[PDB]
Copies of this chain bind each other. A is one copy, B any other.
Amino acid sequence: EALLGVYTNVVEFVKFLETALAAACVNTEFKDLRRMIDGKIQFKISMPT
């Protein structure tokens, strides 16, 4: 009786930067995190009448 094969099953790596979900993101490199607590983004609306 004889063998006939051991078949390679490789799952390809899928990176985040190439899917166009990243068109709903603004990707910024970010050196450390746990040295930061709670960041902030500030607005200012001046409404003319």
Contact = CB atoms under 8 A, between A and B. Distances in A.
Contact of A46 (B1, B2, B3, B9): B9
Interface string A1-19: 1111111111100000000
Nearest to A39: B4
Nearest to A12: B48
The number of times this chain is found in the oligomer is 2
A45 interface: yes
A38 interface: yes
A41 B1 contact: no
B38 A3 contact: no
Contacts of A2: 36, 39-40
Interface of A: 1-11, 36-48
